[PDB]
Amino acid sequence: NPKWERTNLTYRIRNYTPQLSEAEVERAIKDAFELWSVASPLIFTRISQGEADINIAFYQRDHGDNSPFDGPNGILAHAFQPGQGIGGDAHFDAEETWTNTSANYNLFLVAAHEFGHSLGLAHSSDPGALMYPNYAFRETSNYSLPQDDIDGIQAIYG
Ligand SMILES: CC(C)C[C@H](C(=O)NO)C(=O)N[C@@H](CC(N)=O)C(=O)NCc1cccc(N)c1
Ligand SMILES: [Ca+2]
Numbered sequence: 001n002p003k004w005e006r007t008n009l010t011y012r013i014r015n016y017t018p019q020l021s022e023a024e025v026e027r028a029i030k031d032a033f034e035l036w037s038v039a040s041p042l043i044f045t046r047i048s049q050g051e052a053d054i055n056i057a058f059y060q061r062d063h064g065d066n067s068p069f070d071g072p073n074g075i076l077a078h079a080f081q082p083g084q085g086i087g088g089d090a091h092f093d094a095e096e097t098w099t100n101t102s103a104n105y106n107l108f109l110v111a112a113h114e115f116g117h118s119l120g121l122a123h124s125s126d127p128g129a130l131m132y133p134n135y136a137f138r139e140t141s142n143y144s145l146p147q148d149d150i151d152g153i154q155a156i157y158g
């Protein structure tokens with residue numbers, strides 16, 4: 001069970017997707033972290049430059065870590081479990097159409113899903129869970145964490 005042994009974690013958005021404004025990309029990311037924050041003792045702080053615990057980046061195909069993206073659709077992103085260096089970092093497929101809407105692919109929902117991995121959760125077999133393996137759009141305004149995921153972070157931290 002890899003877990004962060006620190007509660008206030010920093011993050012850094014190294015690059016952006018042209019698809020959305022910078023504000024929208026940052027709001028997506030911010031709200032995705034809040035989701036996990038309200039069900040745990042974790043506190044997230046954004047840094048504009050520097051070494052952050054969780055780096056966030058939009059990459060294309062081969063991007064230096066031995067797990068290349070695959071073009072439109074398919075693999076949308078991946079994250080590494082808690083740890084130093086690459087640990088907890090999250091990568092998003094730059095070749096996807098990233099949206100703020102119901103249209104594939106909603107950046108807030110994918111980000112929320114990746115941050116679960118970054119915090120130490122694995123995929124869930126519960127189809128109503130965020131950590132379920134396949135993407136599904138769900139209303140995002142006033143979105144809250146499904147109960148299975150709450151059970152998930154709570155079991156790791158408090
Ligand atoms: C190596 C890939 C096969 C797995 C990868 C994964 O689950 N990363 O977290 C992934 O991108 N899975 C896709 C599977 C798919 N295209 O349906 C995905 O949508 N993952 C993210 C996801 C899943 C569930 C909910 C939400 N919001 C997002
Ligand atoms: Ca892809």
Ligand SMILES: [Ca+2]
Pocket residue numbers: 052053054055083084085086087088089
């Ligand atoms: Ca890291």
Ligand SMILES: [Zn+2]
Pocket residue numbers: 059063065067078091
């Ligand atoms: Zn990667």
Ligand SMILES: [Zn+2]
Pocket residue numbers: 113117123133
């Ligand atoms: Zn996943």
